[PDB]
Design an enzyme around this catalytic site. Structure first.
Site, PDB file in Angstrom:
ATOM      1  N   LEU A  37      21.188   3.176 -13.541  1.00 52.31           N
ATOM      2  CA  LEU A  37      21.754   4.226 -14.390  1.00 52.31           C
ATOM      3  C   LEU A  37      23.124   3.839 -14.906  1.00 52.31           C
ATOM      4  O   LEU A  37      23.936   3.246 -14.185  1.00 52.31           O
ATOM      5  CB  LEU A  37      21.874   5.547 -13.622  1.00 52.31           C
ATOM      6  CG  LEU A  37      20.593   6.123 -13.024  1.00 52.31           C
ATOM      7  CD1 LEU A  37      20.877   7.309 -12.118  1.00 52.31           C
ATOM      8  CD2 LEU A  37      19.621   6.508 -14.123  1.00 52.31           C
TER       9      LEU A  37
ATOM     10  N   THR B 246       0.784  -1.234   0.000  1.00 49.47           N
ATOM     11  CA  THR B 246       0.000   0.000   0.000  1.00 49.47           C
ATOM     12  C   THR B 246       0.816   1.285   0.000  1.00 49.47           C
ATOM     13  O   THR B 246       0.766   2.061  -0.955  1.00 49.47           O
ATOM     14  CB  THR B 246      -0.994   0.015   1.158  1.00 49.47           C
ATOM     15  OG1 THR B 246      -1.870  -1.098   0.997  1.00 49.47           O
ATOM     16  CG2 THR B 246      -1.834   1.277   1.141  1.00 49.47           C
TER      17      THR B 246
END
Ligand SMILES: *[C@@H]1O[C@H](CO)[C@@H](O[C@@H]2O[C@H](CO)[C@@H](O[C@@H]3O[C@H](CO[C@H]4O[C@H](CO)[C@@H](O)[C@H](O[C@H]5O[C@H](CO)[C@@H](O)[C@H](O)[C@@H]5O[C@H]5O[C@H](CO)[C@@H](O)[C@H](O)[C@@H]5O)[C@@H]4O)[C@@H](O)[C@H](O[C@H]4O[C@H](CO)[C@@H](O)[C@H](O)[C@@H]4O[C@H]4O[C@H](CO)[C@@H](O)[C@H](O)[C@@H]4O)[C@@H]3O)[C@H](O)[C@H]2NC(C)=O)[C@H](O)[C@H]1NC(C)=O
Ligand SMILES: Cc1cc(OCc2nc(C#N)c(N3CCCC3)o2)c(C(C)(C)C)cc1C#N
Ligand SMILES: [Ca+2]
Ligand SMILES: [Ca+2]
Ligand SMILES: [Cl-]
Ligand code: NA
Ligand code: NA
Ligand SMILES: [Zn+2]
Length: 806
Positions: free
Chosen positions: A689, A159
């Protein structure tokens, strides 16, 4: 301490939260046990319930009542949602035929259409169809507005990670809420669902929408609602706020429902008891829409209906226990459930060893229902690694299953029948999206998309500049009538060199050999042209990728393939080639098995060398353009150029060879030709990255040849597969992967069987968006197509999931 002797008289659900120790009246005071004495009395009125009745019409205003049916209530902004229906002969919003909202139909004073985010916990994607009979309001929103058949949550499918991803457009690894349960070793602090630590700001990274809004002079309703504020009151509060004076009225609002998640845990995603929760949510929607209509806002406001995650069938008996694998069970802390995370119980234990633990959890039982992983070997698509709060050891748990430490945990902590948190590509974890309003399109279906993309769009709906986030801005422009964000292509930073023949064979001393010296102006002019780029239109279909960083590279042209060769990394950054449907697979000839050839366009000093591969007993090599797919025996000589060679573990060569020898041809058949761009990825710091040169932790022994962490391929064809890849007039179809470059195949429990039994499965597990690959390479693909950039952006965010039908 809180001195609770102040009053909430006129302060109910105050937006500006007052600092301790003066009592609070905001929607969060209950959670901090800090409300003023009269909060229940004044702010949580309930008298007479939530609906007007015939006898309540035009009544005398009685301030005690929960909502009002008096004549003046519309002005005061506090009628019951059904007031006009009962007292003025108006119809419910649901019973009204829907009509295109071509422009915002807002009351004067409204500087922009408001945005209401109606968020629902555990709202599984298939509920839109399966529960449509019991969900008329929601079903009207879906079909008249803009909808996706499902929305892809983030991993883990819990959640807070998901709701805060919605609010920030960030991967949990970047926003910090990496699970429902967390330890941060730097703070030496813990985050749990219960308790108070989760309210400390330091857990919460990035910039959520409400702060992006406020910083940009756009007022926000509060997003977080305590469990004890009933749904009806939340709606009335939002409606109330919507009636405030122009200078005070918030522009962005959130509603939250604990259902259906709450019930779905008890009864499973499809328990007969699930119909009621879905009825009530729909009733709440109807109240909001009725409330909006009364206020003349139902054709002004943009409503988003969105879930955080789905719900799966999970019971007790389906638990795996680490105690059935591990001897040292008490020297570890496990974060349990639908995902496993493991660390040492004590940092003073120098005998603890992740290596031996992983090994003891690897392929130990036949139908084993989880898989251990160093976090940096998790599929890159989960972006679940670059945070100190994510334990080095992780367990991907099979859908429908749990992992606990010891059996006692499971019976001393069957209770549940449903749960969530699994891998985000799993069907049952999929959730919903509906956008309805003037800024959204009318009666439009859009393809599935990732929730990380919503932050941008909500910024667009509000006229806000989004904080830097993981969405790709513009990839969801097709959801929108107006307010689209029109992005430019990133400018290329490094232009390539185009080297000619500049070196003689004899200048190379790389320890490479090739039985090639077996010798006509017909085929001699032809091959120069090939090396000038005559066939380039065929193999480079979407233009060359742009390099978006400062580096030194060469374009190399061949008969069968084209490459951007890195003089820094001494291998291609990309290799591009087209395989038509009719193309034929050939073998590597006997006289060429160990052939590697000097590239007379690229200097010895910028080349790899065969000696280093001989000496490196662990490292072997592969090729980016597969020799198997050479167009002719003469062209096959190009596949063996040193500038096509890349470092590969013999365990990974098994994978690569099967993909190159078998899978490419299969795809070309099934898809009517394919274009393929393959290459290395370097991500030693697992931040998703591109690594600079100084981040490389491993080299082919004795050399400066860096070792990739991963190998990617982008496979493109025509969406209309009746058109061949090289003559495609319309939209493109893409699927991609980022394979971890690993020196064993421990990940695939069946690797001792034939590659046809396990390789493709592994590829599927490591499916990727082109966008993931851009992050990892600093390249920008699809620079020259006939398509609109927004369409190309959507394409780049596409993920091929290999799940069956929703
Ligand atoms: C998904 O989208 C996000 C958003 O864009 C991408 O993340 C960004 O990537 C950038 C590149 O890595 C990164 O830029 C760095 O910022 C550093 C300052 O960061 C602070 O300020 C920003 C801005 O407000 C803030 O967002 C940061 O918040 C992070 O950190 C705190 C913890 O303190 C968390 O609460 C928060 O959740 C968030 O955590 C996450 O990010 C950090 C990275 O900062 C991770 O390490 C965490 O694990 C976590 O995931 C910060 O408050 C800045 O210091 C950096 O500059 C250094 O490096 C450059 C290299 O160019 C160098 O030139 C500088 O000299 C400097 O180096 C010096 O320090 C080094 C280490 O300390 C050292 O090696 C050197 O020797 C030097 O001394 C850098 O510019 C940006 O912060 C994040 N932003 C976010 C929100 O995460 C992400 O890339 C996307 N993902 C994908 C796959 O695309
Ligand atoms: C729509 C939306 C709602 C939302 O919050 C709704 C909400 N209130 C509570 C409470 N108590 C709660 N909990 C989840 C499980 C336990 C309780 O969740 C949040 C945040 C604030 C969570 C970040 C962000 C967005 C977004 N975007
Ligand atoms: Ca939830
Ligand atoms: Ca990196
Ligand atoms: Cl968790
Ligand atoms: Na070797
Ligand atoms: Na194996
Ligand atoms: Zn739940």
């Amino acid at each position: 301490w809180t001195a609770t002797s102040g009053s909430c008289k006129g302060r109910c659900f105050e937006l500006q939260e007052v600092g301790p120790p003066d009592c609070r009246c905001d929607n969060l005071c209950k959670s901090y046990s800090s409300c003023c004495h009269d909060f229940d009395e004044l702010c949580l009125k309930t008298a007479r319930g939530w609906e007007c009745t015939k006898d309540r019409c035009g009544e005398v205003r009685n301030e005690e009542n929960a909502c009002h049916c008096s004549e003046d209530c519309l002005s005061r902004g506090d009628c019951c949602t059904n007031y006009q229906v009962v007292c003025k002969g108006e119809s419910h919003w649901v019973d009204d035929d829907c009509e295109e909202i071509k422009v915002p139909e807002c009351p004067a004073g409204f500087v922009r259409p408001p945005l209401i985010i109606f968020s629902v916990d555990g709202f599984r994607a298939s509920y839109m169809k399966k529960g449509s009979k019991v969900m008329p309001n929601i079903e009207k929103l879906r079909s008249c507005g803009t909808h996706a058949p499902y929305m892809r949550p983030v991993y883990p499918t819990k959640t807070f990670p998901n709701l805060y991803t919605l609010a920030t457009g960030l991967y949990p690894e970047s926003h910090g809420i990496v699970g429902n349960s967390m330890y941060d070793p730097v703070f030496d602090a813990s985050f749990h669902l219960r308790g108070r630590e989760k309210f400390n700001h330091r857990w919460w990274g990035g910039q959520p929408l409400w702060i992006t809004a406020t910083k940009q002079g756009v007022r926000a309703g509060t997003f977080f609602w305590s469990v004890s504020i009933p749904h009806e009151r939340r709606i009335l509060t939002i409606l109330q706020w919507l009636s405030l004076p122009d200078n005070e009225r918030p522009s962005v609002y959130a509603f939250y429902s604990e259902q259906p998640d709450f019930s779905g845990h008890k009864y499973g995603p499809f328990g007969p008891e699930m119909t009621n929760p879905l009825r009530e949510i729909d009733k709440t929607v109807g109240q909001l829409m009725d409330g909006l209509k009364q206020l003349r806002l139902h054709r002004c406001v943009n409503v988003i209906f969105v879930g955080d995650h789905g719900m799966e069938d999970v019971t007790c008996d389906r638990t795996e226990f680490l105690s059935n694998y591990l001897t040292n069970v008490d020297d570890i802390t496990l974060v349990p459930g639908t995902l496993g995370r493991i660390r040492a119980k004590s940092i003073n234990n120098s005998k603890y060893d992740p290596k031996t633990i992983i090994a003891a959890l690897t392929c130990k039982k036949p139908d084993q229902h989880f898989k251990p992983y160093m976090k940096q070997h998790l599929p890159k698509r989960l972006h679940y690694a670059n945070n100190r709060r994510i334990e080095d050891i992780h367990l991907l748990v099979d859908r429908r299953w749990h992992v606990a430490r010891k059996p006692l945990d499971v019976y001393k902590k069957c209770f549940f029948q449903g749960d969530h948190g699994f891998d985000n590509k799993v069907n049952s974890m999929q959730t919903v999206f509906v956008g309805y309003g003037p800024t959204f399109k009318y009666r439009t279906k859009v393809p599935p998309f990732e929730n990380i993309e919503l932050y941008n769009v909500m910024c667009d709906l509000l006229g806000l500049k989004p904080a830097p986030n993981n969405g790709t801005h513009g990839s969801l422009n097709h959801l929108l009538r107006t307010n689209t964000f029109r992005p430019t292509m990133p400018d290329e930073v490094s232009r390539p060199n185009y080297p000619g023949i500049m070196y003689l064979q004899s200048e190379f001393d790389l320890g490479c050999t090739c039985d090639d010296k077996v010798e006509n102006k017909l085929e001699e002019l032809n091959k120069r042209l090939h090396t000038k780029g005559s066939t380039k239109e065929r193999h480079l279909l979407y233009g060359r990728p742009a390099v978006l960083y400062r580096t030194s590279y060469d374009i190399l042209y061949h008969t069968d393939f084209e490459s951007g060769y890195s003089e820094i990394f001494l291998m291609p950054l990309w290799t591009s080639y087209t395989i038509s449907k009719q193309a034929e697979v050939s073998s590597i000839p006997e006289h060429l098995t160990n052939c590697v050839r000097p590239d007379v366009r690229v200097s010895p000093g910028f080349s790899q060398n065969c000696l280093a591969y001989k000496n490196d007993k662990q490292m072997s090599y592969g090729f980016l353009f597969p020799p198997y797919l050479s167009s002719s025996p003469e062209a096959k000589y190009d596949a063996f150029l040193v500038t096509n060679m890349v470092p590969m573990y013999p365990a990974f060569k098994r994978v690569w060879a099967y993909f190159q020898r078998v899978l490419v041809k299969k795809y070309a058949s099934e898809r009517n030709g394919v274009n393929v761009i393959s290459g290395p990825i370097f991500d030693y710091n697992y931040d998703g990255l591109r690594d600079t040169e100084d981040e490389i932790k491993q080299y082919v022994e004795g050399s400066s040849i860096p070792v990739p962490t991963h190998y990617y391929s982008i496979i493109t064809s025509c969406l209309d597969f009746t058109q061949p890849a090289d003559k495609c007039d319309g939209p493109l179809s893409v699927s991609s992967f980022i394979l971890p470059h690993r020196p064993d195949n421990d990940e695939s429990c069946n690797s001792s069987e034939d590659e046809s039994k396990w390789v493709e499965e592994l590829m599927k597990m490591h499916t990727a968006r082109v966008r993931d690959i851009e992050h990892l390479t600093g390249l920008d693909f699809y620079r020259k197509t006939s398509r609109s950039y927004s369409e190309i952006l959507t394409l780049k965010t596409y993920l091929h999931t290999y799940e069956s039908e929703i």
